Structures are given as C-alpha cells and as structure tokens.
Design a protein around this ligand. Structure first.
Ligand SMILES: *[C@@H]1O[C@H](CO)[C@@H](O[C@@H]2O[C@H](CO)[C@@H](O)[C@H](O)[C@H]2NC(C)=O)[C@H](O)[C@H]1NC(C)=O
Ligand SMILES: *[C@@H]1O[C@H](CO)[C@@H](O)[C@H](O)[C@H]1NC(C)=O
Ligand SMILES: *[C@H]1O[C@H](CO)[C@@H](O)[C@H](O)[C@H]1NC(C)=O
Ligand SMILES: *[C@H]1O[C@H](CO)[C@@H](O)[C@H](O)[C@H]1NC(C)=O
Ligand SMILES: [Cl-]
Ligand SMILES: [Cl-]
Lengths: 21, 394, 394
C-alpha cells in the first residue's frame, strides 16, 4: 500500500508521490 | 535547598487562532500550570516564557535558530512544541543536537517513534497515532475481522489524516492484517462516487479520516448505494473535536439532515476518552474565560492539546526536580528527558502515563447510533492503552 | 574603484568518498575554477573555502547552524551543496531565509522546483529529475506510447531512485499519461519473481531505477519469463556513474553473462549527454591527478557533479561581478541569485543554460543494443532540454 514498510523521513518534504506493492 | 532558578522556555505554536493548539489557546494552560508548580523547585525560582509563532511550518526552525544565534550561542532550557508534524521535525532534531529537552502535545506521526537517535530528546504527552491504531487493532481482534480498507484525505501540506491513518497502518502491518489504501484530496474537486466504488470493491469494513463534512458526503454517497444497511462497517477517526454526538453528528440543519441520520447508523466514530475531575473543571473555566476575553469562544471542555501542555509543564518541573536533587543541572537535557520517560503522574484531568519510549499512553472511546429512529448517538465502549484492554460500556 | 573582496564559502558535501560527489572528489574542481577566477573580480580579492562534511543527512544542517551561532551571527557569503535531497532541504530553507545564495549540483528532486518562497535562493547547476522526465515524455509521444510502469527501489533513507522516478511521474501525471507504480526495498530480500509478474500485469513500457545489479536481476527473471524480445520495452536511468551506462553493462565475468546479454536486447538506458572540449582535458588531468594524490582510486574521471561545482563557482562569480556593478554588495544573495538565473555561460565542458527558474536545462541520450551477438550498445538518440527536441541518430 501507500506507506511502504516505513516512512523514516517523516517531516522533511517528500510528499509529491505515494508508494505501493 | 539551592539558589533561585531561572528557567527559560521556548514555546512554539501557531499564532493563528484557527488552530486548536494556537498560542492564545495554549498559553492559559501553561501559565495556570506554572502558577501551581510554585509553592518541587527551590524557593524563588522563575520562569521566562517566550511565545514565538510556529506558523505550523518552517518559521519555528527559523525563530529557534535566530534566537540561538543572536543570543550568541545561548539556548533555552526547555522547548514546548511545535505540534505540526512537518514543523516539529527539525526543531526536535536540533534539540537532540543541543541536548535541549523538547516536550510536545503534538508531533503525533509514527516517525518520531524511533528515538534511538534523531528524536532522542522528544517527549510526547498526547496519545500518538500508533496508539490509536493499537486500539483499532484490538477493536478488530474483537469483531474477529482481519481485512480493512483505509480511506483518507491528503492535502500534501499538513496531511493530518495521512499521518493519522499511518498509525492504523504501521500497527495493522506488523500484525499482518491485510489493508487496502485509498487516498484523495478533499480540498480539490471531490469525486466521492469513486471512493464508494472502490469501497464496495475492496473490503466490508472501512476505516476513514477526513473533515467531518467530507465524511458526511461519503456516508451519503454510499447510503444512496444502499451500503448503509448492515453489509458494511464504517469508522472514522475524530480524536480532537469529537463532541457532535449527544446532538447528532449527522445533523446539520441541512436539508439532507434525514438521509444523513439514516446513513450514519452504520458509522462508528473513534475519539479520545476524556475523563474529568473537579480540578479539571476550574481549569477549564479559567482557560475558557481567558480565550474568550481575547475574541475566541471555546469548545466547552478544553481540548486535549491545552490539557496536554498543562501536564507537559508539570512533567518537566517534575523531572527538573529529580535531576537537581541528584546533582545535575537544567543544562543536562538528556538527563531531564530520561526522567520524563517511563513514569506516571497526576495531570489536570487525572492519571497520565508516558511509556518507556517517551510517548503517552492513550485512552479512546467509540461512538455509535443506539436508537436509529431518533438518531441517538452514545459511547458503546472504551479501550485503555496501558491496561491494554477494551470493553463495552454498561 | 572596488576594494579587495574576501568571499566566505561554505562547501557542504560528504566526507565519505563512496559518493560520486565527495569533498575529496569535488574540492579539486572547486580550487581549479578558483585559480582561473582569481586572475572579473577586484584585484586582491580572496576566496576562503570551508569544506564541511554534510554526511548526506542532518549533519549539514547542524554544521551550518553551529558555524553561524558559534562565531557571531555572521553567515558565509556562499554555500555549496548539499547534494543529498533530504540534507539540502533545511540548508536551502535556512539560506533563503538569510538571503544567502545557495548553489548545488544536486537537490534534483521535484520539490525544490517551487521557489516562490522557501527555495527562493536555490540554483541547480545539474539537470533536475523533472527535466529527465520531460525527456521521457517526449520519447513517449514519439513512439505513440501512452501508458507505462514505474518500478523502483525505495530504501526509505536516501531514496535516490524514488526521487528519480518521481520526476517521470510528475511530468506524466500532468500531461495525462497513465502510470502504474511498484516499489520494493533492495536492501532487503528481493522477490524478483513477484516484481516481474506484476510487470507482466501492468504496461508494456517499463521505466526502472535501482542498483545496477538489481536491474540486471530483474532482467534475467523477465528473460526467463520470455518477456524480453519485443514484448515489453524496459528502460532504466543511469545519469551519473560511467561504470553503469558504459558499453557492456550486462557483463559481469559471471556464469550468466550469456543470458544477461540476451535480456538486455530489450533494455534501453537513459543517461546524460556530456560534451567535452580541449580545456576540459586540462581540467580532467588535474582533477584526476589530485584525487589520486589523495589515494582515492580514480573512478574513471569527472562526473556530472564535479563538472557541476566547477561551473557553479564561475556562475557565482559572474553574478557577483554584475551585482557588484549596480552598486550592491556580496551580502545581497537575492540580487546575486536572480543574476545566476535565466542565462547561458561557458563551463569547462561547454554551454550551460539555466532557465528562468534556477534550473539547469538538461540534455539526455539513450543507450540501446545495436548488435545482439556482439553486445554493442551505442547511442540511439538524444534530447536537448532548452530546444526541447528529441532526435534519433543515423
Ligand atoms: C558505480 O557503478 C558501479 C556499477 O556499474 C558500482 O559498482 C558495483 O558496486 C557494488 C557495490 O559496491 C558491487 O557489489 C559491484 O561488484 C560493483 N560492480 C562492479 C563489478 O564494478 C559502483 O559502486 C558505483 N560507484 C559509486 C560512485 O557508488
Ligand atoms: C531571460 O533572459 C533573456 C536575456 O538573456 C531575456 O531576453 C528573456 O526575456 C528572459 N526570459 C524571461 C522572460 O525570464
Ligand atoms: C472542530 O469541529 C467542530 C465540529 O466538528 C466545530 O464546531 C469547531 O469549530 C471545530 N474547531 C474549530 C475551533 O475550528
Ligand atoms: C519502566 O520500564 C523500564 C523499561 O526499561 C524499566 O527500566 C523500569 O524499571 C520501569 N520503571 C520502574 C522503575 O518500575
Ligand atoms: Cl505548531
Ligand atoms: Cl550532500
């Protein structure tokens, strides 16, 4: 899904695209 | 005894009062808690509180760094806030770099979970999202469900719901529960029809998050599709402004007020379990009377944010007291922080507990529709974090 | 008429030479350009360069901050780097806040594209990913393709490949092309079979990004499924490392070498269109010389990053010259930055054109196999950012 196994760098900038398996 | 102290704290919240945790709203809590702590610390001790604007964004990292520079290198002894995820990141990191303790009733995203390094000096007094997901996981293990669809909104700015459901995910992921993810931007054009389509496509149990109004729209669109009869189970997380029930969360003085009432019958809401106490009453009254003579009305009972910061203040003065006694000083940031972790105390509303990771345990409630004819909504059950047990109300 | 200037430069790159843009690999480039420049600016002018380890993470933020706060409130005159995406955000933000000019051969992600506010003081001397995407978008219009799959590795740390494909995505999503995503951690165990199978589900044109070895893996598996040979059109981006886009990419002196050559008959590679000239030869001689004199095993020569920072300095100097003519000073970063924007100058390798947004126009070339027997991989065609024309070769 759109979260991946983690999101480590939450609160940096990366928010222009989702994720998913 | 020891000489009178001079604690400098840097408060970082949004001046914009359109936020549940703006300065104007939190200040009263801080000051109150500050007037009660005195008379734990050496007689004469003082508190110099600097209230800066976070703008719920970069500004915080700016103000914090400019002060530290102008001050020629001198940093505060305590930093409260920010609350917004994106804004609380660098400040937290820098706090860790400078050995400055940082307490906050915000920064609920699952990323601040890993405090082994980056976020080592961060203590969270409000229940993180992951906590709320620990509950849903429990709630889920109750109905015996195993699959779920997470439908949320994403403004690519603050992303409160994105982070909110992230907690449900992080937790459901570990345990193996299958999860279907569907995101959309409410602010932009709403094509609710699609939402519903995918819903009726994926699972039968749905966990939603979006503006109260957006949830309504989705509930109608699905109702008109006859999905509100008992084939689906709808949920929506509403941890901070959950009080519409008792009046009707569907009701809006709108014309759709009837359809709404109908559809919501299959909609359960998860909120925070807010316990009271005489003290809490007086606190609420005074905090209210201030915000008001300021140009703002309040949601009856002070929100979880205001309550949290109050308790934050204590929790700090509680740890500075223990650190002092052992010999160290306020400048031993990490020491203080470690004192604030893995402990339990009396907050303005009751017991308060911070786990061994610096995150407060949370207590949540579930609201459902007891009498469909009327549209009566009542809490059908509570879940207790620390305890780790859920339970249906009498 | 002008007094000798003393520019205070803060270079922020990694100490670890595992990066194509390490301090040790870039310092020479910088110094070289410095000589040529110190002999345009007032006689007696001197550059003071500070090389600091960015650590491709928070370190870059900490260094900058600690430097400024510690020694007065005096910021540097020019910041070079960071390159890493996550480590350039703060440094760039803090720079745009302090009206300091910031130049870098990195920060290629699509976020630093919005400079109406937070990145106002950032100029990118290397082709951003979004340009690399504008490239694909033309190739796709060329072949009448309208759908594609985006398969990439996402380590949840540096995430280069994610940002890479994010550029392709940003461009496609706007123009209307439909895409299908698919991520996997290559740091973990590779379920190369699932990947290949989902690929079999999605689109016939596949855009890929991952470690040179991982692209090969998938290639073998796909091959095994017979997806190679005409059916699907695989692609993979290799914009920097010559050891990766260089002929014989499929070889490894391994048992599979025969099979691999067989799969790559359908794999096309996307990389940069590097030009050269006499002067560049001098440069490469010295850069090569210095790097080796530092023990560092000469990779192969100078990468886009090296050549980038060299032209970065000429760009800053060209801008200072001009700004120092309208009656301004080195302390007016804004006026300096707008001067580096929307213009073309001569770099060590040739023309360099920065668009009206502070982004270097990029020219790309495609590497395909022209002889399945041999293994020959020559350039099929090129794309020129500024003009915007994709042309096939004879
Ligand atoms: C440049 O690209 C090459 C591949 O073309 C990388 O070399 C591989 O590196 C991995 C991990 O270090 C090894 O397992 C492979 O054996 C290497 N391939 C060979 C045979 O050269 C190299 O790491 C890249 N360099 C940089 C700048 O990271
Ligand atoms: C860019 O600069 C050129 C001069 O080289 C000028 O003629 C052109 O109008 C500029 N483009 C814009 C509108 O930014
Ligand atoms: C929170 O939501 C409630 C209704 O759900 C609304 O009445 C209240 O104004 C909101 N909070 C604020 C102050 O924006
Ligand atoms: C709280 O839990 C931590 C976990 O490491 C443990 O070290 C500590 O003893 C506990 N608190 C006490 C003193 O009971
Ligand atoms: Cl905030
Ligand atoms: Cl870097």
């Amino acid at each position: 899904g759109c979260f991946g196994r983690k999101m480590d760098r939450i609160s940096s900038s990366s928010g222009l695209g989702c994720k998913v398996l | 005894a020891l000489p009178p102290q001079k604690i400098e704290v840097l408060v970082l919240l949004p001046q914009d009062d359109s936020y549940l945790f703006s300065l104007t709203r939190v200040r009263p809590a801080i000051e109150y808690a500050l007037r009660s702590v005195e008379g734990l610390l050496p007689p004469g001790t003082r508190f110099q509180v600097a209230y800066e604007d976070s703008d719920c964004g970069n500004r915080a990292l700016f103000s914090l760094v400019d002060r530290v520079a102008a001050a020629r290198g001198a940093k505060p002894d305590l930093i409260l806030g920010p609350v917004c995820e994106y804004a609380a990141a660098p400040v937290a990191r820098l706090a860790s770099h400078w050995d400055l303790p940082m307490l906050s009733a915000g920064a609920l995203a699952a990323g601040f979970q890993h405090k082994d390094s980056e976020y080592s000096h961060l203590t969270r007094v409000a229940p993180a999202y992951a906590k709320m997901g620990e509950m849903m996981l429990a709630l889920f293990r109750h109905h015996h469900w195993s699959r779920a669809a997470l439908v949320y909104s994403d403004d690519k700015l603050e992303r409160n719901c994105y982070f909110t459901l992230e907690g449900v995910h992080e937790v459901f992921q570990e345990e193996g529960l299958h999860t279907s993810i569907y995101s959309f931007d409410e602010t932009k054009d709403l094509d609710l029809e699609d939402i519903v389509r995918n819903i009726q496509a994926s699972e039968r149990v749905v966990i939603m998050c979006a503006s109260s109004d957006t949830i309504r729209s989705i509930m109608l669109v699905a109702h008109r599709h006859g999905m509100t009869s008992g084939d689906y189970a709808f949920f929506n997380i509403e941890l901070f402004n959950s009080s519409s029930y008792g009046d009707g969360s569907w009701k809006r003085g709108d014309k759709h007020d009837f359809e709404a009432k109908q559809a919501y019958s299959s909609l359960q809401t998860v909120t925070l379990l807010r316990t009271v106490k005489p003290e809490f009453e007086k606190f609420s009254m005074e905090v209210k009377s201030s915000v008001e003579k300021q140009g703002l009305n309040m949601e009856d009972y002070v929100n979880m944010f205001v309550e949290g910061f109050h308790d934050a203040i204590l929790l700090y003065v509680l740890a500075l007291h223990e650190v002092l006694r052992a010999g160290y000083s306020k400048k031993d940031g990490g020491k203080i922080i470690q004192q604030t972790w893995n402990r339990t105390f009396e907050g303005i509303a009751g017991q308060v507990s911070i786990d061994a990771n610096g995150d407060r345990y949370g207590d949540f409630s579930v609201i459902a529709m007891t009498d469909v004819e009327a549209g009566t909504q009542e809490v059908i059950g509570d879940y207790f974090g620390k305890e780790g047990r859920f339970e249906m109300r009498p």
